Amino acid sequence: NTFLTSSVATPPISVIRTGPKWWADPERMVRQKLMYFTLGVDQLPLRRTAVIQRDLQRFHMCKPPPRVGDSTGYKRSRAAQLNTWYRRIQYQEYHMQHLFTRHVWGLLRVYPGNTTKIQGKADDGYVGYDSVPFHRYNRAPLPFPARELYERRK
Amino acid sequence: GVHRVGYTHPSTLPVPCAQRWDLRLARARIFQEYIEEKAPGAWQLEDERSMSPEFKTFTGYPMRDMRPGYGQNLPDYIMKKRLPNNTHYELFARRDIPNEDNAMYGKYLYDMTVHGTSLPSTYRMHKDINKAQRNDRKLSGNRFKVLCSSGAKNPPSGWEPIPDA
Amino acid sequence: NRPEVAMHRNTVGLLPAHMWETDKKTGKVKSVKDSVRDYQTKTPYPKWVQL
Amino acid sequence: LKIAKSAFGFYLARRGQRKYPFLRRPHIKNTHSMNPSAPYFWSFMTAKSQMAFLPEENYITGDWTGKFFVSKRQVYTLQHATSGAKVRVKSFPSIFEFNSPSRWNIGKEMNTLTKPRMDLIDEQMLTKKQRLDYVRAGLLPK
């Protein structure tokens, strides 16, 4: 991993709201798929996501279907329910990506960006060479040189 | 690689032939050319932007040279540089001036040929007319300011200003 | 030498330590001696200049 | 302008905080000209080459009666120290004199020996409002 510096975390929903621009950008989604496939694990959530989003993109310039007014509000609530389903289908994916990426990085002897967990290796966030001399969230002092997660041979 | 540039004189070859460097010196005599001795061999860099048909900015010629430090200061820059004489700067110097007609002819000349006389500028005429109008009602909100004061302070032997009321 | 190329080639022999006054504990320059009064030179102008 | 510190206070507009093209601001105010660097000492705000000759302004060019201050791009020379002659420079409020000669000055331009913006402030060139605003920024005590 080349990008090492401390970062700003964005809530999952705003990441998903980027649609085609980032979250569903074809290019990105394909190399996620590559990671999964190479690990020998089906990519179902990715495929659900890709389906939902593919279709989002196809109809993205159309006006929504005409609404008739109801005291029930069954329509509004069914649209909502469907929507939060899709949101959750994608939360699951977003989680999977962060999960597997961290795990794979643990196998590749990769050091993550500052303040990032790698389950077996760095439990509290890993940090080295931050702009700030302490670990940001522990409030503990950082050693020089940067802490090493892996034994030396390569 | 770091090497010594080298030259084989044609008398030494097993066929005489005209060496490209020798030709280069010919070309330098003909169109008199400064040969920069310190020009680093490593620094050939075309200007990608203007010289590659791949960029929308493609003129076909090396618009700038890509040398970071290069400045108007350097003797080399001075030697190939367009002097300001007879460029647009000269054109501005002459044609852009406060009253554009003073570019075409002497005002006095024109005035004296066309009208019988020199004419004051419009502004001056305004102040003149106004003085005449407001000297007709009130007097003595005024002052007497001249270029040369001696003419008022010692007036000629005659000159008895008409009393006013 | 400026830091860009040869910085590591600077020597301690470049410092005019005899010109200033140091604090023993810190290792820092506290004061500077006066330069001009005792200053002797055979070359106010370069050697080849005769006015 | 709001306050007229010179004639130009009358002629010029500020235009808020307005951007000018790179390294052309209409008025050359070199606040940085004395800005200490040990390693860059000989390259910063000085001649780009050490083989350049000293400027025009180190020489007496014509028949002079005398001068009031020498220019600030004049470079301090061993003779400035040694000769014991008046060396003045035009700074604000009035003039800065080099009175206490040192060899440490030698080879730099007086731009670099004269602090343009002093940490010292006159309370008497300040309006009561301006003094307030200088207390807000934590400069003047009050």
Next chain:
Amino acid sequence: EDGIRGSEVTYKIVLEGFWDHHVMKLAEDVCMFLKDVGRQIVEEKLVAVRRLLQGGAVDPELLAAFNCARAGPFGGLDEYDKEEVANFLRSDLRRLEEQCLSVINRCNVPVPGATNIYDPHTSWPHVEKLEPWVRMAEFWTSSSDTSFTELEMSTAHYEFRKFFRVIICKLPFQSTEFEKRMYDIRHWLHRQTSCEFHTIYRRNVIHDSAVFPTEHDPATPTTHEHHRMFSFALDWQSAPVNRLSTDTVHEGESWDAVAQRLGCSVGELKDANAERETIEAGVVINVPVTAT
């Protein structure tokens, strides 16, 4: 070359207005003018040519010009008789008649329903378009001392424009009369419209192997050091170099000894010096210009 693609002289008149239609209609005006004047001149030339074709003598001078060679292609001084020379002359005149006729015939194509002055096959002179000069001015419309933002938000775009048409006339010969009419169209141009005149003509230059001789490279070569900055002003003379046309005869010398020293045939050295029959020591002599 034949037809449209070749000529002795080309004039390009570059007309410029402030408005596009101005320059378009000016180009129609000037174009029809040059069509008429062109046809008149070229017709005159054509009758001169047809007369020269019908018959004429040969200059003694033109014959002499064919016969100045030390050796022709067949490796000896060649004798052109007046016949042959007249035949060369005649062949060129033939070609000039074809060209004249081509220009005239295109002058007569563009009638009122049918006029197209853009294609060169359909008219003489023809007209080429030239991309317009367009400068865009960007500026603040606000007068505000207080805010930069408000100044930027008011920004106008206006353009200066200048429009151009080009008129091309290629002629098979050069006539000062045509050139004169053409320079004078600037006096009757349309309102607020100007023009340039480009000329491309053919001209004889003369390469003198006498003034610019072709010699071996010097026994010592010239370095990069004769090329420094200001070497142009310091280390070099302007070409051509001055080679002396006059030499003094040394004491022991003789005609052939002098010729040998100067690099000539003795014949040459006698021709250049024809006044003198014999050459004494310390006498001034003319060096034949071909001398090596």
Next chain:
Amino acid sequence: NAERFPHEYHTPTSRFPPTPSETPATQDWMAYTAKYLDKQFTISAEPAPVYNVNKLWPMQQIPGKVDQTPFEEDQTWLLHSIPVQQLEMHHHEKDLQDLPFINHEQFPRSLEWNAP
């Protein structure tokens, strides 16, 4: 003492990247091997064409001058002493038309105008 400080005395004819002093056997692997590694190596240099070999090309250089060839390795570019543009930037023709935004024009000729 000027040669002792390489980055200090830059005349304004001097150009980057600086050229390193030459080294005797360096021009090809055989020469190098012969002089440094294995000293009984029979071939002292790799066969030298009797005609001139122009190592910088198309650029012509002054014969007899120690020179460098454009670097193939990225690191060689990156770690050399080549500087970045810092002050305002100049062009010997284009300086007369001041900036790109002030684009001074003496006459309004078509930008495509062609000299006869």
Next chain:
Amino acid sequence: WAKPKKRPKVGQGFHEKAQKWREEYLLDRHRALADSLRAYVEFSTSKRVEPWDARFKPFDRIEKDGVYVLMRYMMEEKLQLCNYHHRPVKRLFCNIGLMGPQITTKARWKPYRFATNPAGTSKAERMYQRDKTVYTHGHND
């Protein structure tokens, strides 16, 4: 656009104050300069932490193999002569050639300010514990 108010007069005896203040600001600057030159040279002369980032390859490798072998037997003397300053160290690695294209491309180096720490540096805090009275641009210890 309001008519500009007139600026109040300068001050009385402020010409003397400005003279004195600039005078001894300059006198002070002489020692600040002297001291920062001392510091700059002391830094150039003294040793530094290793410039390469060991978290990546070819540097992570156990100190008894690979690049470290190449360093201990061929480059050691030179690496010590230049005091592990990051610029000459990186250049020496380019000129040893037995790594060759990798130095800039595969290998990672510590960031500027970390690489500038004195040899022996244990805690990161050290970057901030250097002297601020001295004008070296972070080139001081």
Next chain:
Amino acid sequence: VSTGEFDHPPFQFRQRHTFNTTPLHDANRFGGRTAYLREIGPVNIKKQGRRFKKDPRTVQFNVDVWCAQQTLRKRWKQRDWEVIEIPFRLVPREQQRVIPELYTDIPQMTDPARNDFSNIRNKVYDREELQGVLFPAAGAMLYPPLQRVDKQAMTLDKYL
């Protein structure tokens, strides 16, 4: 037809390290060259900065020099050859012509009549075919002659 970045990103509100966004002078742009352009830290505008490092035109110029280096570098790594200056006699039949200098005429075909159409400019010759010409002094050939493949020979690909 390169996919790489040739343009420096425009200055805006401070970019931060995010999904989908990195800092402007981040170490990952332009192969870490951005070091040269970087003012680190929460820069105090009034007192500190280096002006050229925020200037669009200057910055872009620097980046353009760097790109030029990249291309030059790769064009030279692409050469396997030297230019040798060989007298007109001894050169192969295809070069016995006149060869206009670069960008002077139409890009030129080596031998249209023999069915070879390719830039004469970029034709490269084997050091082994020019051996007799380039090292006449040596007697015995220094390089052993190229061995060539019989395209009429029955070999594994002809299914025999």
Next chain:
Amino acid sequence: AEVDPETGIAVGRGCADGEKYHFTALLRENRDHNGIITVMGKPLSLVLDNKAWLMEMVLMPFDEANLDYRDFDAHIVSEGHAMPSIANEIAAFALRMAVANALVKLIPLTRIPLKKSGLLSVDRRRERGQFPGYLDGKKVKRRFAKR
């Protein structure tokens, strides 16, 4: 059908962003059944950077027309602003359009499926003109403060 009688070539043009992308497709029938698409002298794969979601846009007109893409040779020419990489969806939109217009000049009836699937249809959209009033030069107004 507007086709060059000798070369058997037909010519369409695509646009997107009114300036940025102008393409011209030369389309001709391949009788050997090995067809290929080429853009500015380079194979389509390389030019669009192997990104599938771009290249399938250039496949679409052959689909809609119920044709086998391998029966056709195409070369596309960039007449707009040149750039080192045209792989991006807008450029691809323009490409698809050029190809489709060529196809229609070549096989006239094929126009009816194409027109219905909105291939031949041209969308007119542009980046906003640059303008110094806005911070970014395009969409963003400067900071505002109450007096």
Next chain:
Amino acid sequence: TATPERFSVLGTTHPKPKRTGFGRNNKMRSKPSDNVAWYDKGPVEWLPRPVRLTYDHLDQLQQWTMRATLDGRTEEFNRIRDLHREWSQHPLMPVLGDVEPKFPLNLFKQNHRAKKRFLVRWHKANTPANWLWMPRGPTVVTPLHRTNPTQYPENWKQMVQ
């Protein structure tokens, strides 16, 4: 010259004050903030920091996977299979009336921070260990996946009759 004992007017002036705080207008305190990670909930810190998976990593991955296959190491494949099985189950369709809360209008002006501050603080509180709409557990029946190591192809010899 000769650095003086006293400085009359130099140290005389009023000292500039130390800043009390950081960030915008130097007024921000040092405290725990929304951007702070929680390392106590699940394998991923929450909220997750940005992560860039590169083709470089994909190649290193391939080579690792290969080298592992050839040394007959089946264990990390099994941990990965487990992880995947746990977190990839299909999330259940939500009941009507169940939606994520929006931020109340007429609280702050539309350009205010509070908006984002709400969103973050919501998603921070729902960690993936709190997602109840995805069915993870030992209780869960998983029709799409293989249950344990014994059912994967490298066990194939025991599957033989």
Next chain:
Amino acid sequence: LVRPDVPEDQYVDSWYICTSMTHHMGDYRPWSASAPPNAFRFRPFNEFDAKGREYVQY
């Protein structure tokens, strides 16, 4: 339509007025007068569109 439907060469974008005017006061020539007689989609030549003409020529 704001102004008569006619080949635009007949119109000039007015100075100082936001409007176009006709460079021959008020006369109008129909499209038919720009092309040859009975020109398909008034065209210099019927065989091809502008681009078709270009690349056929090349």
Next chain:
Amino acid sequence: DNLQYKRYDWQGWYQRMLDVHNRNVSLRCRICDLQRLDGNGVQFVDMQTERRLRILAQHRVGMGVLKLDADKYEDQADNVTFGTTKLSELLADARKAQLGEEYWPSVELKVRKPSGQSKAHYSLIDNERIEKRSRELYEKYRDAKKRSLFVTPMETWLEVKGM
């Protein structure tokens, strides 16, 4: 100028300014028309002379037309003088190719590095000597490896000068 700068005190300086803006005189000739028999029966410009002409005037030739743009003097007359001179001076130098082969400009071939096939022999260079030697080096190594854990090439065949 027929418009504005036609008639008054500025007509003079504007006129002159145009004339100086227009000093350039373009001088052309086809190299074709230079190949003709000279007065001496020798061809004035032959193949070699043409090659030399092209190399001497570099970008000043295109499409087989030599073109000199003479800008040096303010007046067109002087530029035809100047241009004409440079032309004959350049012809004078190109014509040297008729003095003998030494002046025929060289051809620039791109000659490949030695091939893979040649480079293969690089590993057999001095084969005998190197095997015979490597046995002695093996002895040196066997012995050195009784003392120390790691034997460097610098203890065996490599020389590194200590002082």
Next chain:
RNA sequence: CCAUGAUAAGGAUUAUAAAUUGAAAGUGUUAAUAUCAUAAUCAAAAUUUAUUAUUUAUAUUAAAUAUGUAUGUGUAGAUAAAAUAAGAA
């Protein structure tokens, strides 16, 4: 230095087709009231002014002289911008 005129900024309901998301209500410099005064850049210069998007950690001062300062858990209060070749219902 009293001594009239005139052009800015400032989204809130004429919509999609063959079509523009910038307005008149006036922002220093401009034309009839005069009756204290030479204040104007051609360099190298002195922060108090509402009205301004700066470069944040692999590699860091070469040509006109060109900015030494604020590392502090992306952390108060209060504020800014956008539905236009983009992707928001």
